[PDB]
RNA sequence: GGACCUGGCGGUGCUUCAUAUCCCUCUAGAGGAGCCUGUUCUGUAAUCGAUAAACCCCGAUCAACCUCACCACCUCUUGCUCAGCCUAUAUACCGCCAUCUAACCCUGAUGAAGGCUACAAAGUACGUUAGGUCAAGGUGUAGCCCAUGAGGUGGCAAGAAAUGGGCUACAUUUUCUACCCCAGAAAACUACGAUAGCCCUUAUGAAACUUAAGGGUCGAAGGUGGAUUUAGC
């Protein structure tokens, strides 16, 4: 057990291994930071371990050693919160708020916080229960006509999951010495790589290594392969295309051309058949590959 | 030279000694064991092929009864075999080349008849014996025998045989005279006027003989003149004198016999101011001692800026190494320290303090003694509980 | 050291000779590893002192090597390299140089220096024999 | 001092083999060209033969260096398969870790 | 006894206490610094007694103010990279032949590496004083050695034992290729 | 840990380049490994709190030892300097000790 | 003898389903011949082990000599170690695998006893085996000790089947050539097919029918193989 006054005699010698650690780095100790502390650790003890973890670290002693609990009354014996003996004081605190606010109210791309983490917010252990409850109170605020103080308190307890699902990336337009606008993109499947060029105005002409496509790919399934992105859109014969391929064999070669010429195609379409490609699949890198 | 360790790292100068004599007797026990049993060591995979990595080979390897076995025995400074197999070429009718027989000669006078580890010239010993059979006694014999007997004590020896050198019309070296120098002061029951005076005939006759002195000659003449105290001053200093005009450089030798025959002193300033700002190369044995003996002055006279001069020059350069053994270190940071905590501001003196101890010595109790009666002057008593951890 | 330090310092003795010195147009050097974290603090450290000592410096990292094999079980080698390219150097900044960053080089590092040294044609090749 | 009576019989072929290589190079390129005459080749197919049987080197085997194991040696290493996992596993051997 | 590390100032002169590459020192590295995975419930292991960190190749002896001390001090024993020579454009004009080789640094008693022999001279045709007739001979006998996009002869010389016999005979072969293509035999005409 | 953590959460006791792609002479250096550990634990009986770790550098072989706090420091001493030269001269290389004390058996867990 | 409490049930049947392995169904192949490779017996002067059972493309990412620890004789003896034994013993132990078999608080009148409802009503905190294995992961003990040890030169017999694994075929979605996918011929007996047999060259080696590669000769059976079996993801 670590008790308190190790804890102390652990931060001064934190403080004092700091500025020891700045004076060899040749930093000023007064602006020397946790992530100068990291920088100058990673470089006076190199340590490739895959385990973040099992590599040598210099933390502050508050981070690396554990937590306790907090003082809930002072000498004279009061609790300091008006909820204290529900033992719940945070959780019902918490409610109280939102009850508050949808009462103010009635007057007038993303998670929900999971279990765990409103325990480590609210620094209490609490049931499954407890936690619906006070997830279909946030729900209800969140339905009522919500202002931006009630849009911000809510957000308090929403991480992330990203929406980017939504939106492929779109290519930046380029312009070539003559003047022609053209968009660049990349594709990969199994071991074969290509680069395609589109041409914002052409005549159907796709060029693979210098080569007419259709010399360059005999088989009718490649050349339906490379068919399908432009006649997804309905926009053959209305674009030319300078692809450079290599590597795998016909029918990769042939996807990783298609997956090119799509991704530099989405850059001359609406965002909404940008949306439709991504539906069909025409946009998506393939991952599968030989196992071992 | 000890270990970063705490458990290992020595706490005491008695306990440094003894850490530093284990290693070595550790080092001699491998050695040892290594050239006692070569055939687990002869074995090379380093390329460059390293030379001191290999077993030493200390046996004759020629058998036979030959010249070469002889000088391959000196070579090896084995002393018994050497004479056993010259008695044995001279039971066979060989005859022994001139070169050979005063090598040997060379390795029994210095070594008096002993194997390799004082020894006092034996009457009749082997060099004598061999000495006496040479059928041709050449410069080179005389002179070896004479600086034998004088390195060994047989001076009188030394001064009869180099009486017989002279009656044989032969000549000596710089080397020799230096012995029969130190063979005349060593003759007991004479007098200074008279000892001072047959230097000077040996110093005529060095003349005679058309032998130019060396930095030793005058090295031991200041050596022996120390013996006799106050009638020694001005001669010492004459012949200080006499060794820089005639373009012989001093060196840290010759400084450290005046000092300690003055010392029984205000020379000592004008040898630092002389000394000031020099680099110095090992010209003499006693160079070493220097440092000590002049540190020694600067105590008696209680002079810090002699002292800081000292060290200054201890400074420059590569001086340091002429500090000398471990016991002579000791005494001159001992006395050192004593003086800047004698004579030095408080706060001086505890920058010295953190300075050189541990890194360059560790104190002996009376230096801590004298470090807690400079804070006892200098009324920083917030200090003796530092002092005190330190001291244990 | 606060008050004990050394009067005088006897720096090397580097004569001048009149021999014309070596031209590097370029020098490579490959260093080999089984860490990463080495050989970035290593590339750290070389970096620093190219830049110290007015030499051109840029560097790349080559694709690692990896030896599997197997006795089932299964062992692995890696191998990762950082390559130095140094550029317009002479023949005395290049010994220097490779003299510190080779003894300076941690346990389980190998190095791989290619020197391109620049020469003139030979007086026999300036014209044909009659 | 060897492992073993194999490992000494080995030790014997590789010190015969190497200083019998010379000689029985020289004598084996007069047999491996067609332009000396079949008369010399002829002789030197017997002066091959008469050498010590031991003096060949294709009687030498990669016993292990540790335990004299006569198969599963890895060359690198001269070491067999047991020995080198023994070292492997504890990570006396520099660079070498399981695969994942 | 306590570690020396209490005895430390914090603005001292840290390249002293570590001049050469030495193994991690608990006693002398003044940093709280934990190396090890951690038990249930528990902390990276403490650095006294830490054999990982005992097998971390530190650059505590290479700190940028120690780095920065060291290259001070070694600028004396550094040449000018003549002034004239801005890029490769005159390198290869003033300079037109090139020689690699290449150095092997290992750990080991025995520092022979025979890779080391190995010696490449390059030099470009159009910088040799060639004719016509000269510069096909030349390229007919060379062969492969010969590459036409970048105009440039590689002779590789590993025959000899040592690096400068190997630098010898390449400067030989040069010499006998140029010699010779300025040579017409008899049979020459038969082409 | 497991020898599946190898180069996850330990390291390799014995650093050398012999392993690596295009290096030579990685059995002369296994071999030197297995003599150097079993001649150390032979000179330093019940003294090796933990296993060596042999550090090379060009020409260069640090033994670097964590030993116990039981034997005295001038046996440790006689016997650094003993297994110094003998290794020295047994390898043609200069060997060097790095001897680590500790109070006891770093215990980091109760398997 | 009356009333009540905990039960267990070391017990069953049925109902619904979650019901994954195991089923069942479903998909795609192989299985019948010719070879090789282990192994079984047999045979032999002729390696071994695997000792109840369930793990032979087993030790071996490799057997002309060596490897080799098997057999015939010949030949040496305090012997590479000062010995040495692939000699026995895990049917001596040891490693290994395997077979089998709390505290507190409330309620019931302070009885055995009981304690949940979220729009919340008392609950909070091993043994066993005549087992395997000495490629020892170990430690010991018994034997042989002018041979259970060395060394040399030659030899491990093979045809009856019984299996496993692999290869190669029985073709037309095929074979050859160009080419690398827009062609021309061949085609069921001079069709396809043999990693089948025999002969000749090349490689390595001291030694090659005896190992491998190619060429020639040859063009066998084979004609698609049920019960079964192999995978699926």
Not at chain 1, 19 to 25: C, G, I, V
Not at chain 1, 244 to 269: D, P
Not at chain 4, 50 to 58: N, T
Not at chain 5, 159 to 182: G, I, M
């Amino acid at each position: 057990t670590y008790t308190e006054d190790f804890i102390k005699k652990q931060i001064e010698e934190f403080n004092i291994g700091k500025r020891h650690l700045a004076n060899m780095m040749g930093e000023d100790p007064e602006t020397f930071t946790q992530e100068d502390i990291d920088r100058a650790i990673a470089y006076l003890f190199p340590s490739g371990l895959f385990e973040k973890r099992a590599r040598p670290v210099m933390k502050h002693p508050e981070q690396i050693f554990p937590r306790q609990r907090a003082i809930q009354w002072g000498e004279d014996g009061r609790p300091f919160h008006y909820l204290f003996y529900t033992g719940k004081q945070s959780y019902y605190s918490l409610m109280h708020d939102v009850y508050g606010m949808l009462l103010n109210l009635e007057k007038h791309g993303s998670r929900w916080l999971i279990k765990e983490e409103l325990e480590e917010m609210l620094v209490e252990k609490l049931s499954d229960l407890d936690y619906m409850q006070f997830i279909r109170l946030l729900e209800k605020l969140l339905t009522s006509q919500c202002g931006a103080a009630e849009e911000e308190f809510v957000q308090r307890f929403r991480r992330s999951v990203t929406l980017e699902s939504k939106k492929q990336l779109i290519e930046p337009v380029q312009y070539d010495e003559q003047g022609m606008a053209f968009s660049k993109s990349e594709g990969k499947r199994k071991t074969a790589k290509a680069e395609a060029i589109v041409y914002k105005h052409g005549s159907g002409r796709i060029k693979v290594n210098g080569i007419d496509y259709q010399l360059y790919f005999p088989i009718t399934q490649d050349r339906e392969q490379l068919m399908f992105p432009f006649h997804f859109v309905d926009r053959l014969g209305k674009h030319d295309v300078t692809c450079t391929v290599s590597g795998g064999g016909r029918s990769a070669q042939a996807g990783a051309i298609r997956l090119a010429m799509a991704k530099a195609l989405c850059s001359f379409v609406t965002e909404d058949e940008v949306e439709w490609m991504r539906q069909a699949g025409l946009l998506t890198t393939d991952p599968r590959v030989r196992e071992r | 030279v000890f270990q970063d360790d705490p458990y290992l790292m020595p706490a005491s100068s008695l306990e440094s000694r003894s850490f530093l004599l284990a290693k070595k007797s550790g080092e001699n026990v491998a050695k040892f064991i290594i050239n006692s049993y070569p055939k687990y060591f002869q074995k090379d995979i380093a390329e460059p092929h390293i030379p001191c990595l290999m077993p030493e080979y200390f046996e004759p390897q020629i058998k036979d009864i030959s010249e070469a076995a002889l000088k391959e025995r000196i070579e090896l400074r084995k002393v018994k075999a050497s004479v056993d197999m010259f008695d044995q070429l001279l039971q066979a009718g060989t005859t022994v080349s001139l070169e050979t027989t005063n090598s040997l000669l060379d390795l029994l006078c210095y070594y008096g008849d002993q194997e390799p580890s004082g020894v006092t010239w034996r009457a009749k010993n082997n060099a004598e014996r061999i000495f006496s059979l040479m059928p041709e006694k050449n410069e080179h014999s005389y002179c070896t025998m004479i600086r034998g007997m004088v390195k060994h004590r047989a001076y009188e020896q030394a001064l009869n045989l180099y009486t017989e050198l002279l009656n044989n019309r032969l000549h000596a070296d710089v080397y020799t005279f230096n012995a029969l120098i130190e063979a005349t002061v060593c003759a007991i029951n004479e007098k200074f006027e008279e000892k001072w005076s047959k230097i000077l005939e040996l110093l005529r006759h060095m003349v005679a003989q058309k032998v130019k002195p060396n930095l030793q000659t005058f090295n031991t003449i200041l050596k022996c003149l120390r013996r006799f105290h106050v009638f020694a001053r001005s001669p010492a200093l004459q012949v200080l004198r006499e060794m820089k005009a005639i373009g012989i450089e001093p060196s840290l030798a010759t400084y450290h016999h005046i000092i300690r025959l003055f010392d029984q002193s205000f020379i000592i300033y004008d040898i630092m101011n002389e000394l000031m700002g020099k680099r110095f190369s090992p010209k003499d044995p006693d160079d070493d001692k220097f440092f000590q003996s002049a540190m020694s002055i600067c105590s008696s006279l209680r002079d810090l800026e002699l002292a800081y001069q000292v060290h200054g020059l201890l400074k420059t350069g590569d001086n340091w190494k002429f500090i000398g053994p471990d016991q002579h270190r000791n005494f001159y940071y001992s006395k050192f320290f004593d003086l800047i905590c004698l004579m030095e501001q408080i706060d001086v003196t505890l920058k010295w303090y953190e300075d050189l101890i541990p890194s360059a010595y560790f104190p002996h109790s009376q230096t801590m003694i004298h470090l807690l009666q400079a804070l006892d002057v200098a009324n920083r008593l917030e200090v003796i509980p530092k002092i005190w951890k330190d001291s244990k | 050291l606060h008050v004990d330090v050394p009067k005088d310092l006897t720096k090397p003795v580097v004569t001048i000779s009149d021999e014309p010195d070596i031209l590097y147009k370029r020098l490579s050097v490959l260093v080999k590893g089984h860490d990463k974290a080495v050989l970035d603090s290593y590339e750290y450290f070389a970096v620093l002192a190219a830049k110290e000592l007015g030499i051109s410096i840029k560097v790349h990292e080559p694709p690692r090597k990896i030896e599997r094999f197997t006795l089932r079980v299964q062992y692995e080698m890696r191998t990762l390299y950082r390559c130095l390219e140094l550029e317009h150097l002479t023949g005395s900044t290049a010994d220097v140089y490779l003299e510190y960053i080779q003894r300076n080089l941690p346990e389980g590092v190998a190095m791989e220096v290619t020197k391109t040294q620049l020469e003139q044609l030979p007086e026999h090749i300036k014209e044909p024999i009659w | 001092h060897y492992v073993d009576w194999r490992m000494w019989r080995d030790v014997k072929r590789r010190k015969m083999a190497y200083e019998y290589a010379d000689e029985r190079l020289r004598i084996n390129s007069l047999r491996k060209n067609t332009i000396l005459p079949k008369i010399l080749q002829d002789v030197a197919d017997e002066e091959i033969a008469a050498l010590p049987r031991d003096s060949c080197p294709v009687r030498i085997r990669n016993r292990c260096v540790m335990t004299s194991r006569p198969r599963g040696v890895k060359r690198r290493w001269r070491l067999s398969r047991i020995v080198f996992r023994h070292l492997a596993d504890h990570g006396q051997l520099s660079g070498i870790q399981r695969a994942t | 006894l306590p570690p020396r590390t209490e005895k430390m100032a914090v603005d001292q002169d840290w390249p002293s206490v570590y001049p050469v590459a030495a193994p991690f020192k608990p006693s002398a590295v003044p940093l709280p610094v934990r190396m090890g995975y951690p038990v249930k419930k528990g902390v990276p292991m403490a650095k006294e007694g830490n054999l990982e960190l005992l097998k971390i190749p530190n650059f505590l002896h290479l700190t940028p103010v120690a780095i920065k001390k060291h290259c001070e001090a070694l600028k004396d024993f550094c040449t000018e990279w003549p002034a004239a020579l801005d890029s490769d454009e005159k390198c290869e004009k003033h300079f037109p032949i090139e020689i690699d080789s290449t150095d092997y640094v290992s750990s080991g008693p025995s520092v022979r590496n025979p890779r080391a022999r190995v010696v490449v001279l390059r030099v470009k045709l159009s910088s040799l004083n060639l004719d016509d007739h000269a510069k096909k001979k030349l390229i007919k006998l060379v062969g492969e050695r010969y590459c036409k996009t970048t105009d440039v002869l590689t002779i590789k010389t590993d025959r000899c034992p040592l690096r400068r016999q190997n630098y010898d005979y390449a400067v030989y072969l040069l010499t006998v290729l140029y010699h010779e293509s300025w040579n017409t035999e008899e049979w020459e005409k038969s082409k | 840990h497991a020898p599946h953590y190898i180069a996850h959460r330990k390291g390799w006791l014995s650093l050398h380049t012999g392993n690596l792609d295009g290096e030579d002479h990685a059995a002369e250096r296994t071999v030197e490994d297995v003599f150097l550990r079993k001649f150390m634990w032979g000179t330093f009986p019940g003294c090796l709190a933990d296993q060596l770790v042999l550090k090379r550098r060009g020409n260069q072989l640090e033994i670097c030892a964590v030993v116990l706090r039981q034997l005295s420091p001038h046996k440790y001493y006689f016997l650094v300097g003993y297994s110094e030269t003998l290794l020295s001269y047994f390898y043609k290389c200069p060997v060097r000790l790095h001897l680590q004390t500790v109070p006891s058996k770093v215990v980091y867990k109760y398997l």
